[PDB]
Design a protein around this ligand. Sequence first.
Ligand SMILES: O=C(N[C@H]1C[C@H](Oc2ccccc2)CC[C@H]1C(=O)O)c1cccc(Cl)c1
Length: 135
Amino acid sequence: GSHMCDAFVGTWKLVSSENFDDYMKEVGVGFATRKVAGMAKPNMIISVNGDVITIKSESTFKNTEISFILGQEFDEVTADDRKVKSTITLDGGVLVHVQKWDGKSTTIKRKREDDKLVVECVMKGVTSTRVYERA
Ligand SMILES: O=C(N[C@H]1C[C@H](Oc2ccccc2)CC[C@H]1C(=O)O)c1cccc(Cl)c1
């Protein structure tokens, strides 16, 4: 039983980052965490089992893992240790991840573009783009 979200499945390694420090400032991440998180070169491991999608990240900074069903809110601990309420949906082929905490919101979009997985993170008007390639 294939699904469209199978284009995301696999092991991905970070190959470029743009404006991540500024995005983290807008989110409210402190200096020391920004510096060490910004240095990280995570791998992201995406898998699907039935209706459950898992996204795991492994890095020298932190390892994180989320499992979820599309459209069903869950509580998430982020790499920077926010406790957030998250919902992830598929909108036209893009995984759209909204995180809410403390009256604030940020959106992380994940899309396949050529052989890359492109992650766009937006907090108010600030966008960071993080590009992954297959490991
Ligand atoms: O989950 C991680 N990355 C994702 C979600 C991040 O959210 C953050 C917001 C503020 C501070 C840090 C992260 C935004 C960037 C995303 C990406 O895919 O690159 C991740 C996991 C382990 C280590 C590290 Cl450095 C990042």
